[PDB]
Symmetry: C2
Subunit: 263 residues, 2 copies
């Protein structure tokens, strides 16, 4: 009964991927909360369980499907289902462990991994950093197959971890950043896979801090600048929300917005 | 041959005043230069003399007219004509003294005041501060008559200075600030004259510094905050251009905009 958004890598185009990411954002955030033109995800505090998750059903040209579950409070992939098995990342706390019992409730085999789904852990398991893992439609096609065959022994753990890394960036981080969506659109448009450059990686790593800096800013002005990287690895200093409006599409909730306090 | 914009206090309404201020802004600035949604006046450096001034022809219910000349580089009233006499404020420099020789060239009697047209000087001459000089349609009607009768001895210097103070705020400062335009619209809507409150005065006093702070900002963020006042005299700190977008309609040119430098 949680909302489902479908995407397939089979015959994917820039437009079908764009439609997908736009639909994911529309199910993640309501429109209740915008700070400087930038939407905020729902606050976890008090959020009813019936509103906590969305489902992303991924299919591929191999005619396989898996369903990822995303937490609306942070766009995190918390687990997935393939046929009669579901797997969840190690929960951070008891409330999250209870919350995930509301997902895939009729699945016959439920497993919780001992490891979390954060980049650092998944890179260690994959034996490769994000900077050496290619992204694009082909990688996502392959990742869907790898997730699908895990329960039957066909997928080694490093491949599973790599596959999660691909899914998370192409779905969660693309949802979080129009810039990252744009980078995936380019890969799809040319059907050319490639690892993420420093601009993509530094945005992924900075999403939480950017969210806080924007929400705690003085009328948009950061108290302390945030350093990002350009595609060539050189430094890009962020002093203000303004430069991020084309870049970041949604934020994790970090504080209540201060009073309007217009002149 | 400089552009002329007409306004009359006779039967003035919110809409006729709004039309006037919008037309004045359209003749002051071209649209070539916008920083954070806020237009910038032309740079004085290299500005051809044929593009340097605009004329505001003011009429009143008494069937009198005067023409103010405004410098497009700063929206300053530099002088005025009434019938066969023209009067100019004391120029700041030789280039400005030459520039004003291009105004009202067929007038039979040309005078340059020994005093400048800045608020501080005009308040001293008027024997009253801006905070004690009522603004509104009635004050402007009266100011037009006072300017008109100056050359024939009917207007004492303090009344002339008061009249300039009214004109400058209701035309130049209204053009510079949508907020000040709004305050004059309110006075016209209710036909109720009243002196400017601290929010109006502090904006007038801060226009140059706000212009510089916006143009020198880091992506909109001020390096140092600017203190304004609310209507009740309490402090309002400005940290960012964002809060000024509804308030300031044009800026004096202070520097070239830095390169776009988008992420």
């Amino acid at each position: 009964q949680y909302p489902i958004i479908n995407f397939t890598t089979a015959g994917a185009t820039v437009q079908s991927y764009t439609n997908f990411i736009r639909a994911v954002r529309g199910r993640l955030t309501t429109g209740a909360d915008v700070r400087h033109e930038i939407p905020v995800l729902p606050n976890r505090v008090g959020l009813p369980i019936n509103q906590r998750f969305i489902l992303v059903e991924l299919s591929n040209h191999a005619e396989l499907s898996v369903t990822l579950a995303l937490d609306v409070t942070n766009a995190y992939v918390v687990g997935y289902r393939a046929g009669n098995s579901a797997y969840f990342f190690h929960p951070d706390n008891q409330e999250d462990a209870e919350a995930i019992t509301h997902l895939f409730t009729d699945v016959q085999n439920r497993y919780t991994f001992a490891f979390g789904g954060n980049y650092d852990r998944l890179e260690q398991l994959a034996g490769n950093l994000r900077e050496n893992i290619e992204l694009g439609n082909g990688p996502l096609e392959e990742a869907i197959s790898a997730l699908y065959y895990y329960s039957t022994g066909g997928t080694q753990l490093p491949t599973l971890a790599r596959s999660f890394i691909i899914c998370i960036q192409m779905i969660s981080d693309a949802a979080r950043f129009q810039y990252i969506e744009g980078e995936m659109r380019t890969r799809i448009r040319y059907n050319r896979r490639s690892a993420p450059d420093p601009s993509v990686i530094t945005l992924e790593n900075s999403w939480g801090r950017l969210s806080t800096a924007i929400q705690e800013s003085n009328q948009g002005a950061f108290a302390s600048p945030i350093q990002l990287q350009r595609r060539n690895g050189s430094k890009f200093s962020v002093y203000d929300v303004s430069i991020l409006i084309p870049i970041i599409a949604l934020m994790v909730y970090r504080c209540a917005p201060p009073p309007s306090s217009q002149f």
